[PDB]
Amino acid sequence: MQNQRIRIRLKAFDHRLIDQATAEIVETAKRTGAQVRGPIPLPTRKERFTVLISPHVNKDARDQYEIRTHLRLVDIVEPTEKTVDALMRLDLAAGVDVQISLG
């Protein structure tokens, strides 16, 4: 198997915003370089919360909440300084944060 050279990761709460930003990066990486891959989807996280539904009492009835967090990996085999420049000029998303930092 591969060893991770650098980690490009997108982390988001919005399921739709991450899908638009990764697709853009995948293009930018082809438009300023030669050695790109289709974005690995990478597994999505979900945190579970339960709270009251009435202001006071009504213990039976309750309410249940989800918050999704979506993770993409892309996996450019080699980023060009131009890929990283382009990525950073054409950034505009809010539902996602992209990390070009590594771990």
Binding site: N3, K11, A12, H15, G38, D63, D91, A94, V96, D97
Partner: protein, 232 residues
């Protein structure tokens, strides 16, 4: 009095949130308390303008505000001094320097919150309110949309009990999971205590306005897509 509140169940499909940022779990409270602070103090300074929504957005190193209004110029004020004072207190409230752009203005004369504000004023000013809600419902269905519900509370007429009344007309679905449907509940005071108006309005059963991408990966994006299948 049953049912979950109408915009909270619609957020996973085709309805936006009132805020969209990302904080990498550990900081999510520090961002929420600061985001709540921008909502609470910002709209408080622009009290004298007319407003339908507040949409808060956080790219890297920026907080970008989208704001929704009855007309484009109300929030700008004279020669940009009024809106620069707005970006002034957002930069102060947030942990980063601040941006603002104005949204598309859309259906402002029948819109959920600009109607609800309009009804609350009548009551505020101790006007008789004999027809006022019935004309709210009528003008909104005369200006667009496919159905409205109005429910009015705050001790109607000066009664010494709780006393509500309501009117729904056209089609207003209640358990709907598809399309944006616009709901606002205003809160405002008068002589006998606190009053409030509930405005559910329904424009249409299909809205496309937030989705996951159209296509599988290979036909979308880059021409040369193919993996090596080894070749590290």
């Amino acid at each position: 009095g049953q049912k979950v509140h109408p915009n909270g169940i619609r957020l996973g499909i085709v309805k936006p949130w009132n805020s969209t940022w990302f904080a990498n779990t550990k900081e999510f409270a520090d961002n929420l308390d600061s985001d709540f602070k921008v909502r609470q103090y910002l709209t408080k300074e622009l009290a004298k303008a007319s407003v339908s929504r507040i949409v808060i957005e956080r790219p890297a190193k920026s907080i970008r505000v989208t704001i929704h209004t009855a007309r484009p110029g109300i929030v700008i004020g004279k020669k940009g001094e009024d809106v620069e004072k707005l970006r002034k207190v957002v930069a102060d409230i947030a942990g980063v320097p601040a941006q603002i752009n104005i949204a598309e203005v859309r259906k402002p004369e029948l819109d959920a919150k600009l109607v609800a504000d309009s009804i609350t004023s009548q009551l505020e000013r101790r006007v008789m309110f004999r027809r006022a809600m019935k004309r709210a419902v009528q003008n909104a269905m005369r200006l667009g949309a496919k159905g409205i519900k109005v429910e009015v509370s705050g001790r109607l007429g000066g009664a010494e009990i709780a006393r509500t009344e309501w009117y729904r007309e056209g089609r207003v679905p209640l358990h709907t999971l598809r399309a944006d449907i616009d709901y606002n509940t205003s809160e405002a005071h008068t002589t006998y205590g606190v009053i409030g108006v509930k405005v559910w309005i329904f424009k249409g059963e299909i809205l496309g306005g937030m989705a996951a991408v159209e296509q599988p990966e290979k036909p979308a994006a880059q021409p040369k897509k193919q993996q090596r299948k080894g070749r590290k």
